[model samples]
Target: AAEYAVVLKTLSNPFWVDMKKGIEDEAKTLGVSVDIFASPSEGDFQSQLQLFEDLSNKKYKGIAFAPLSSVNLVMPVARAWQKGLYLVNLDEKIDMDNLKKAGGNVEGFVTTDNVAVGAKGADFIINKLGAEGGEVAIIEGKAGNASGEARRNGATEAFKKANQIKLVASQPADWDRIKALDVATNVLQRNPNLKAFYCANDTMAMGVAQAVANAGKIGKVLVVGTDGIPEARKMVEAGQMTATVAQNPADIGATGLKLMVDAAKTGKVIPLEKTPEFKLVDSILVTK
Candidate 1:
């Protein structure tokens, strides 16, 4: 049997918590012992770098990583590869061109189709607004983050196609609840006629929902979020939020571990050419 390691973004949210659960459950079934680690907070790339570096020295058969930044992790990944650790990219994708430039080889990638996630949220808002259309805002995650950028672009494209809907404001909340609340409050003040908000993640959605409620527009201003977290689901159940795009975070974890174990058993890194460019997990729309 081979041992493995999985690194996640943080344990601050239920998304990662559930992801951890999935990885653990799957590892048990495969009869492999896997160690899991995470950064203290989101966007803490330095901590992630140190963790990856430490893991590389431990001589694990495989390592599954969710990088905080697409570019910053290239060197760390390359170093891990040099140590002969089979690598699987999880959740946040590393930029392939930059990874190649840095001489890193990731065996596989597992994540949801982020662009589709945003488009689904946008479609929900448009349907709720009816043919009349209305103004909407977007609360983004950390700027330059690949997932955040993809979600923003997907929503932007959907909004452009709808003549009736106007995008009033779009800004990054840096994936912080407090920042999201403050940003949403300011956007609500400036665009009092805003009809809805599409947030990049559920944590930010909680902040946006609170802002909407504080403004006395709870039911009037629809709020949509991604990453179908438990709290977000409760908010949906209570009618505090309109809906959310739910991704199977656990599936990403489970899939990454399975791939790693298979590679370890074969004693060969899965060739990048043979692997699917992106092993996309499906997402669903949750509407209370």
Candidate 2:
């Protein structure tokens, strides 16, 4: 029996771990072997790229990955294509044009419509603040990543349309809660009039919420974020954080794996232009 392999972004994040568990369960149920790998939380693009190379060399049946960046894995993935391994991109989408041209096939690409998520979060804030223009701050994720860029765009667009709120500070938290807290604290200090904060992911949202509380103004400032992790949801329920936009990565993992298995069995290379199933997928604004 041959073993399959999957290299995800990180296991430290609960969201990623949950998605990994789903994949492992599905693989076990199908009696297919699956090995999991990941990079660190500190954004080790080179390490992740190396993992892809090592896995490809093993002649794995398929490859599933959550890329660190758009350009990080291009060379390794191209090498994987040369070996005819099935490829699937989970969580974050990558450059399909380059991959397709290299014959570096993609069996599936799975992710949420993060733009909608951002817009939805913005809507939640606008509604809560009563349509009156206020100052909002954004805690951004890593630079140049698709998820962060799309969500920021959505939020910016939504704020623009509302015409009530002005974006005070849009700073990169780099997806770290501690960093987010530090940045948020500084932003609050600089602009005491800041009304709300929007984070790209729940991890940073947690930090922002803590920072607000530590500053002795929990309920006065609204803090909203994406990725409804249990902790962030609890904060929302407790009225510490304003709201959370839940993005279902578990569903994305299940769907991406199913697509990869199907493509491999059929011996048909999946088209890059094909839009895999996507949705808000219970992506809603959760607030007290």
On lDDT, the candidate that comes out on top is: 1
Global lDDT scores for all candidate models: 0.88, 0.81
Q: Model 2: per-residue lDDT, tens digit, 1-26? A: 24667777787677788788888777
* Model 1 agreement with the true structure over 97-147: per-residue lDDT tens digits: 877767668778898899999999999999889999999999998986889
Listed per model in order, the count of residue pairs whose N, CA or C atoms clash below 3 Å is 0, 1
Measured against the true structure, the TM-scores of the candidates, in listed sequence, are: 0.96, 0.92
Q: Where does candidate 2 stray beyond 4 Å?
A: 28-31, 100-103, 268-282
Instruction: List CA RMSD, all candidates.
Output: 1.6, 2.2
In candidate 2, how many Å is residue 69 off? 1.1
